[PDB]
Structure 1
Amino acid sequence: SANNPWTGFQIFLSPYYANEVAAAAKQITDPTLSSKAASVANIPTFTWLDSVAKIPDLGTYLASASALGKSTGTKQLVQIVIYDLPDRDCAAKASNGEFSIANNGQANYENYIDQIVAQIQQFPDVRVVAVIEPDSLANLVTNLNVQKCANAKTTYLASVNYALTNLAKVGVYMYMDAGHAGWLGWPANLSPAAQLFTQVWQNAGKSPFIKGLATNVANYNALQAASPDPITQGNPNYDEIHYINALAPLLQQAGWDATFIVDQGRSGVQNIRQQWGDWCNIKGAGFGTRPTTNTGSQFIDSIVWVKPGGESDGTSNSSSPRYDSTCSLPDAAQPAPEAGTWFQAYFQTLVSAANPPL
């Protein structure tokens, strides 16, 4: 649409991912692949606020971006993921979310949002783009038969509402997570999804800062596939562009001219999954299209890298209290370390298999 949050801004590069990548490139023995790997630190990624412990880091990133913009004559943009719902990941076998509905989860989550808002408030010269709660609202479309999700529904809705309402007060541009083509892009899921996202947008006051939806976050789908991945049989929306082309008009009819961002950080290699639902450390993934507003679609503001490729999706150690057995499937790279920790072998393949090449 008229106002693309990225136009005219320089994206602040994550220092944490930069540290991980430089350390990783040092361990890659081939010199040429090593320099390819090091250049990944110059590719903008999203910073995940997956716990309250990450909020002080948000503060430093905002302050660093502010000073960088003044130093270089630019306007800076910081990319964040809001990811700390109580009873997080309600349909999963394991979750690493620190908050529970049973232990004041709503109030704890509000305080998490309040601390984030208090940081952002202090740096009005820095633009912020936030992905709102991956693996949350999409469960309320398809997974209400999961008892943990059914019992979490009112909390997910209330907490996402609190995030939208209060981050809007400090001008954050917001994209609600909306799964991917193999989750909500099934034609039969489109209208239920549109009805839910519209109701959430309405509850938060239809703020213009609620720009739309984020798709393929931490997943592996093509934006535009050469041919349908065999995992997609039965779904005519076999890539993200088909999904977005089908969902966007439904939102527009509800009065919400929604735009989209699409994760492609691990989409360089297609046809690597046995089943579409397999999401953990999928073996053979490559870095995909680098972030750009040259998206090829009226509905898509930016291709983005939301999930930082190289950080594990989960351990394959079945004795871990955080073990999700999805991470032991035949198409999951193994052995894999705990979620969020660096997975060096996986990063090296992401670099080697990058498409386009690095």
Structure 2
Amino acid sequence: TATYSGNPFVGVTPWANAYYASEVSSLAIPSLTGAMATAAAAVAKVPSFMWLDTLDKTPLMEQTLADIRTANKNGGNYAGQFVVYDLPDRDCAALASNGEYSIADGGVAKYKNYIDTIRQIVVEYSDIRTLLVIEPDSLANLVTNLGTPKCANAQSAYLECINYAVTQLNLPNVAMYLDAGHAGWLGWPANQDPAAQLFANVYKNASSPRALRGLATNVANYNGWNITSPPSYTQGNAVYNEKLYIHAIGPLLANHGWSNAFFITDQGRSGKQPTGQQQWGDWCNVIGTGFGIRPSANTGDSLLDSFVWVKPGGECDGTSDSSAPRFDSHCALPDALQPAPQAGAWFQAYFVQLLTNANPSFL
């Protein structure tokens, strides 16, 4: 019902979900006052993506869509934004993943069951345009981390599952963007063609789904969209910002059979450049970051359908508690803000850091 032609971000308005607004209003604002408290309240109104990282989270997707349906009846012209993130043996390169499904334990079957719940929801809410980011931190590993056994052994499962998700969610009211890492990952010249080759193969293998509009980049990362000078940590890589990355891989996708692929790029934590990253590969609660460019389809660059906020600022990337199960040492590095809670949990000090270093400012 909520069909569209071309850029799915045009003709609609991204919904700022109640989940994130609850976190900010009930977990952050009570600790703030004056200017900060008022600025914080405005952050809750910026639309970001809701992550469906567990099967238990799926009911929240419907509640969100239900809120949208109600809003849309009253002049509302909103669209839902969700991240599909629950592949079996998820985050194969990490020493310890929080993923709930394991390939060796009927993981692929469970993933398909997971996708089935989501498709049923989208079909029930066909009247709502649904924008989806497909499995961050998955396909990118197949380009550079096959040297890691867990990744080598998960390749076929990753490919099978992603093919199931894209074909089953290929609906008229849906727009999917395959996670494609970021400039510092696949942007390196040597990784470009192999990456394009892979994404194009996933597209064609899924019979060129009309709903698969393109790729998503910088998800949960901090790269600049169009910074004019190379940060020290990007040395050696000519592709040091996301604009350069999509313009590099874009033509290669077409060379490999995927024409008319577009992109969306995360800027939710890219507001301050350069970041406090000591190494480009430092991904956990990086210090020296701020909210970035606001979600908008007026990108001034046709390859980019829209600036977006996929990783919600304030929600932790991982704990710095070394006694916690699945603790990752990257979250205890000198350039990671600590002490930090479990991944996904509210991290007040990081929210304040983002708000404080926001550009455009909220204050």
TM-score by length of structure 2 reads 0.96
Question: Does 2:7 match 1:7?
Answer: no
Give the secondary-structure state (helix, strand or coil) at the position aligned to 2:191. helix
Please state how far the C-alpha of 1:61 moved relative to its aligned partner: 1.0
- Counterparts of 2:201 and 2:258, CA distance in 1: 11
Look up the equivalent residue of 2:352 and give its one-letter code.
Q
Name the CA distance, whole Å, in 1 between partners of 2:171 and 2:12. 21
Instruction: Please tell me the root mean square deviation across aligned C-alpha atoms, in Å.
Output: 1.3
Give 1:258's aligned residue. Answer: 261
1:265-295 C-alpha deviation (Å, 9 max, x unpaired): 0001122100000000001211001101111
Residue number in structure 1 paired with 2:295: 291
Q: Which residue is equivalent to 2:24?
A: 21
Distance 2:67 2:361 in 1: 30
Shift of 1:22: 0.9
For residues 74-153 of structure 1, what are the structure 2 equivalents within 5 Å? 74-153=76-155
Q: Which residue of 1 aligns with 2:356?
A: 352
Q: CA deviation at 1:65?
A: 0.6
Q: For 1:214, what is the secondary structure of its paired residue? A: strand
Deviations 1:186-211 (A, max 9, x none): 01111000000011001111012110
For 2:57, the aligned partner's letter is K
Asked if 2 retains the 8 angstrom alpha-carbon contact of 1:93 and 1:325, the reply is no
Q: Deviation digits for residues 118-144 of structure 1, max 9, x if unmatched?
A: 111111110101000000000001100
User: 1:79 is matched by which residue type in structure 2?
Assistant: Q
Deviations 1:304-324 (A, max 9, x none): 000000000000011111211
Residue of structure 2 in register with 1:332 after alignment: 336
Identity of aligned residues (%): 55
User: Structure 2 residue aligned with 1:235, among 234, 237, 246?
Assistant: 237
Which amino acid is the alignment partner of residue 257 of structure 1?
Answer: N
Distance 1:144 1:248 in 2: 23
Q: Report the alpha carbon displacement of residue 27 of structure 1 after superposing the two structures with TM.
A: 3.2
Cα deviation for residue 2 of structure 1 reads 6.1
Question: Is the contact made by 2:171 and 2:211 (CA closer than 8 Å) also made in structure 1?
Answer: no
Gapped runs of 5+ residues in structure 2? none
The 1:171/1:205 distance shift into structure 2, 3 A limit, reads farther
Q: Aligned partners of 2:281 and 2:164: how far apart in 1?
A: 30
Cα distance in 2, alignment partners of residues 2 and 299 from structure 1: 15
CA drift at 1:38: 1.0
Distance 1:26 1:330 in 2: 28
Q: Counterpart amino acid of 1:339?
A: A
Change in 2 beyond 3 A, CA 1:280/1:255: closer
Per-residue deviation at 1:25? Answer: 4.1
**TM-score (normalised: structure 1):** 0.97
Residues 67 and 29 from structure 1, CA distance in 2 versus in 1: closer, same or farther, beyond 3 angstroms? closer
Task: Check conservation: 1:25, 1:35, Cα contact below 8 A.
Answer: no
1:159-181 deviations in Å (ceiling 9; x for gaps): 00000000004642100000000
The AA in structure 1 aligned to 2:206 is: A
CA contact (8 A) 1:75 1:125 kept: no
Question: Hey, what's the Cα distance between the residues in 1 that align with 2:66 and 2:329?
Answer: 40
Name the amino acid aligned to 2:81: Q
SS at match of 2:170: helix
Q: Partner of 1:42 in structure 2? A: 45
Instruction: Tell me how far apart the structure 2 counterparts of residues 210 and 53 of structure 1 sit (CA, whole Å).
Output: 26
1:255-334 → structure 2 map (5 Å cutoff): 255-271=258-274, 272-334=276-338
What is the distance in 1 between the residues matched to 2:9 and 2:184?
27
Gaps of 5+ in 1: none
1-structure distance, mates of 2:308, 2:333: 27
Q: Can you list the C-alpha shifts for 1:301-350, whole angstroms capped at 9, x where unaligned?
A: 00000000000000001111121111001100011000000000110111
How far, CA to CA, are the matches of 2:60 and 2:238 in structure 1? 42
**Cα separation, 1, equivalents of 2:250 and 2:239:** 13
Aligned mates of 1:50, 1:231 — CA distance in 2:
30
Q: Partner residue of 1:202? A: 204
User: What CA distance in whole angstroms lies between the structure 1 residues aligned with 2:202 and 2:305?
Assistant: 21
Q: Which residue of 2 aligns with 1:167?
A: 169
- Residue pair 1:62, 1:78 contacting (<8 A) in 2 also: yes
Is structure 2 residue 241 aligned with structure 1 residue 244?
no
Q: 1:8 offset after TM fit, Å?
A: 1.1
Distance in 2 between the 1:24 and 1:84 partners?
26
CA distance in 2, matches of 1:252, 1:264: 25
State whether residues 172 and 211 of structure 2, in contact with CA within 8 Å, keep that contact through their aligned partners in structure 1: no
Counterpart CA distance in 2 for 1:82 and 1:26 is 29
Partner SS, residue 81 of structure 1: strand
SS at match of 1:42: coil
Equivalent residue of 2:70, what SS?
helix
